[PDB]
């Protein structure tokens, strides 16, 4: 089985980059349930401000993980996104927290974070040599992505700098 | 320690249950539905390919429907792939990139289990709570709905299914 | 050769009959609302020419829900003017160019008809199709609401109905 | 008793009677067009069932435009069920369930006479009265444009129509 | 020392000369429209007070349109209080502060002018320019349409008006 | 305590009493002008019934303005059904199912309070707080035109009005 | 004399009462609601302060809707500040400038009163009219959704409230 | 004949407040007409920027004409809106300028607005006495009248601040 | 083999070959006012820069319309780059980065011919087909506006042209 | 050498005066708004953070509009850096990354000399021209609410103040 | 002579030649592409000549920023149907009215080029000018999905193209 | 005391270290920018007045996003009237009230510091951190076409400037 792929890359060089956004396509699908776990089981007195927070970010989310899954699909390969998909991918351990603090919640989502940005940070730089186009489009996400894990450590941020975790 | 006003704590944890197995059956959905949006090959591609997207985005809405109204009843929510697993009564979404009609096909199969367990959470749902009832009631409209959009497909002139159900 | 997981062959058929009547009714109804439109006169024409068209794209837009309802039920909805006819359980709006007074009270009439059929449609589904009776609960409303509006022209302080 | 300022009571009577019954032929054409909207099936149902609305929205319109027209030239337009069928020239849309191929073919056809009515009334207003006859010739170019909608969907390589 | 590529000299200036007067006849219209929009009185009021808006808007449009045809013509447009009432072949509108009725009456009258003057310019640009003769069709309905709406508060169960035309 | 920069804690104290009554009569009115529009009823109901609500929605937005401009100078306002009839000088809206004409009558009364009210105190304000004054000026003109949309449909043919 | 199309003057009459209790509880309540709007302090402020808003919005047109529905039914709805008050069957809310803690604790339990009295005129309603049962339980799961919100903000993670 | 008026004032002030209103009237439907008429006759290499700047206040002053002839209907009079009514209040000579250069209308609609502005201004001090609420009603329109004369002004203005008539 | 109902294939032929030109006449012109659009220099550049974009954008559609009458006739559109250089009749626009006038100087003649041959289709049409002429004639009278807002800013005061 | 047409040259020049150093008021305020909006940091971040947006936006027309104002009186306005710091009678605003509680009782200052001076000027154009005057007071309103959202966050449950 | 501050007036002059060959290829495809919108025929023919349109749009866009990307480098843009063929490497689309399968196919060969040829530009932009490499970057990312949506029509069952 | 995951504290500080440079240059550049919006003068002014607004709002959020890159990364992002003219390495802009070509010349060489010194960061984070060199990258595009909206004024008949 193989037939066609973008015009100006080789076989090997698409199922590398597909193989890649795959991991990523199942990080995204992960990500924006835990987040709407979160949008749920928020308690506190500033509830009200970070459930809405999140929608944006789940939505926006939701958009890469389209983007991400038909670029796979534009590469040749075919896109695995049922929650087999996920689990099957998925790197690190299933969100523990449930109804509790807002607190709580978003020094857990602080961590998650930091497994995706970085992680979308290495497949980065492992896609300059492979397919720029691919990495531009990961660039953006991580732009956006960095930034809500500001929104969320911004909520943490002590009077000085330190996170207050 | 709470729930809604009017409601005993018992039919409370009952509907809560409902709901939940509710929820990751939505999940579960809008998860395998842009699974084969993206998946589906063949002449008739960007018809269904397009087709598909509203109602992702309406299963998506009734989710958090759904998960909002167990939390509005005291218990907790539970909407992670791991929980969605659990719940889970069936199996994944097999069908990787193939044709339009084999996805269809299988999309019906899907739809006739969540369909039809719906429904019986709603005569279920009579004596717990109305309110309840009729959001599932609103729900089922439009999964039944869409249901008929994807046998229209199958469908043969007369109106017989074409079920590669095998 | 199919229908909705969940119901029976025979249930299915029956509840898809009864629609397929609702649907000829808000067929007729929605051609005579916009009947009415054109044919009205008066000191008070354009506030009842424009209060119909609302209620015209409200009713024709229930017409599309039931008879895609009804195909979702395994059986062919017929929309074309002579199945209207066959199920006509009613005679054909009479009035021509009149006064404001004289359709809206003749539409008074008409709406008993359409609310009281379709109020005895929703008890024998209360047995038969949840999902279909919740579906004509709400059109009920609607119907419901705008007889009050035709209505309210015709009250009169006392709140008797001056036909 | 009146008509519009520059027609002659004669000249108005015959436009009106002319689209009195254009117009019971869009109120055909709309209903028909939700009929078919609901009943087609294969595998490119979709596109097809999304295809129908707009004209029907189109032509729906239509009629509310010739209709108050009508009524603008004194006489009064009749839009109940009843009037559609007294004005009819062709029989009842018969395909009920079936293919897209099936009911697009026989769309074609119910266009066929749509088209051609339309494009004769046009002809015959040209001595009765001008803004009449541009508004149906403005009609006939977007009726015109969705045969060919329809019959592109029959086409095949030779622009030779397969019925 | 410039017209529309394909007209001649001649019936461009009789075009302009047309349009000219159809400009002061709109002015005068949109004019006179909001001036009843104000002065009307009576149970119908806020119904026929904001049913005028629109044609008001309309209208206004129109005077633009024309202008800048005569402009394109190769002429220039008069569009003062002083040149609207140079054009004007008849005479101011009368009524002020009056009933509903009073005024749709007067109302109904000044159409039959504007109208019928408007149909004879276009038989009468059907030598000169098509395109002009089109533009004027397009605003002939909406105006005949409008006196409709006006005839039809005057109009009496059977089909007679009630014009208090004295 | 603390109040708006430049204002005496006098001053301030005043205006919010003025206010805080302007409060209760904008919050009475609302809730009567929504009153009539349900109990209205004759030929003309629907323009009426419609011209009411922009009112509504005008004069409950105005309500929510003068209340946060009381609790910003330092005060604290009072929404609530008791609130509401402590502040009332005048009595309940009595007209209850009657004709258009009925219950414009009575509501241009209501205004010709709400008017004089307002007015007296865009006069006392004009020495405590212009930020204020202009406040209810804007209002006055909007309560102002609302009343002459009211007695226009009791006007005579001259300018005379019938209650 | 005239009602609901079905309906017998006695069932309909039970309904109009039970509504207009429902009308004077939503025009309290979106009084009352508009009114913490305004004295709610603290951090947690701007988030709070908005939140209100919509289902203030919300509420105000639930009034509108049942008491329409009052009308519908022949009776004729009552609103004003006097009606408030005679309907009423608990106190005037009493809170007056405070943090938002003591606001929603309070408002939590008003709602709870709401949402009881609601719950009960639903199942009153199954053998008086079905429409209108329909109306109160969509009503129903907004107000019991905001509910949530208030709460969620008093809770402590073991879903404990903090009055 | 006579009858009503708003709650608060004389028929005495009201009359006055009214005979002022219904010389602004006049003027702001001479105004919008001669603005549109200027919007037509103009030509020059600047054409397109001038032809639209004017529409914003076309629109703007009829709107103006609605809210002020309303006002006097408010105040118990009749409001005047007819060619005739707005010649018969003119107090000025009609707009002289046909197809012409952008700097001749444009020199031209300055004294135009120096006319209306200064007319204005006059009315509004003649109110403070009569209605604040229709010297509100003005003093808006003042300053949108004021700015438009600002735009007009700007195109003949000198590099150093004289106007280039 | 299949074209409008109520044309002969002879009378449909020649109507297809008019428009065929008019769109390549309409491609040339697109891409030719978008070429302006670029190399517009001067003093007056962001007027003329945008003035453009919309007379672009509508003759974009004017092609789209014309290519699918040609289609809904029976023939089939041409409109590649190859295409437009074989029905074009004049010369390929010459001005490159340029100031305004001169581009404008230049548009005016390119609009001369437009406008002449469009004009000559419409007379032409009317033994053809009235549908289609229709069609042209609105083309025309925004094509004829155009060319004026060019040549507007070419006039001097006596209207006369400076090229 | 031109001014507003009926304006003292003399008085013009005061009025430009007063706006000038209203001007970059408002500027180094969108300036700081901004500014605390990118650093502020606590629990209840969010609220706070889309909670300056509004004003920001808001000041930043303002900026404008007393800009193009001062324009057409005749002289020129300063809206660089520099000139912001030359009218400046206020010191830079010294928080840096902080708690909400702290920038907003910055910010409260803050405000107190900004509404302090705009009312100030306000008195000052009473006789020196009304539509500037009108033109102040309109952003006092807004201004000054925006304080009290402030203040709200600060407001101790009887209405005291935490700096 | 002029340029983008920062670039050698060489490096300049080389991307200049770059997007200038691009643009001709943009222009060519979008005029394509529209020929093929109208030329399309079969049953699936109103999916494939609806997914057309927003292509071009898209398209056309990139042509305007390629072209004033050119200019702002300080050269001239050509975009008139002369200048489209003489930077022009592909010869003439040759596929008139066939069916969608031949036309998809085709056009996958037509974006093989496009696409191989945009990737070779962006690598050699990538010495001299970023902003420009970024920027056909973008234009790859949704001419190469576009070409996917092509090449779906013609997959098999596991992977596999059919032209 | 924290960054973004996956970055040397080092790499970071010398990242936020531009930006922070970038900041001020921005928000100097949204404030000269209206400056010159209220100054300019000449018989193209409303042309480029309203020309220069989209660009004031764009570099206004520009502003913004690199703000907000600066907390994210961890520091402190300063944007009072003093930090923007600490950050400073020019002169603020000189041109009072003058006319559109002396004012474009001068904004002609602003923005050649500003593209020149973004150009120079956009390379020195190339190996610092590729996030925030796409979002330096982005802006270059659109600050360098609004540069040639400047220059296009500027430019003679044969691509000169005019300063
Ligand atoms: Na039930
Ligand atoms: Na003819
Ligand atoms: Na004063
Ligand atoms: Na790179």
Redesign the interface.
Known sequence: ????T???LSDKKASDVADLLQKQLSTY??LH??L??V?????????????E?IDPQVELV?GY??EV???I??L?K??????????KD?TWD??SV???????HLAALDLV???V??DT??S??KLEDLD??SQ??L??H??EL??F???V???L???????TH
């Open positions: 089985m193989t037939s066609f973008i015009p100006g699908n992960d349930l835990t709407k776990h949008h749920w089981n928020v308690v506190g007195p500033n509830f009200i401000g970070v459930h927070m939701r993980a389209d899954a038909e670029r699909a534009t040749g075919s896109p695995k996104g049922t929650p087999g998909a996920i689990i998925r299933d969100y449930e109804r509790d603090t807002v607190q709580a974070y930091n497994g940005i970085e940070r290495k980065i730089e720029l186009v531009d489009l660039i953006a991580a732009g960095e930034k894990q500001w929104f450590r911004a909520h941020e002590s009077a000085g700098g330190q996170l």
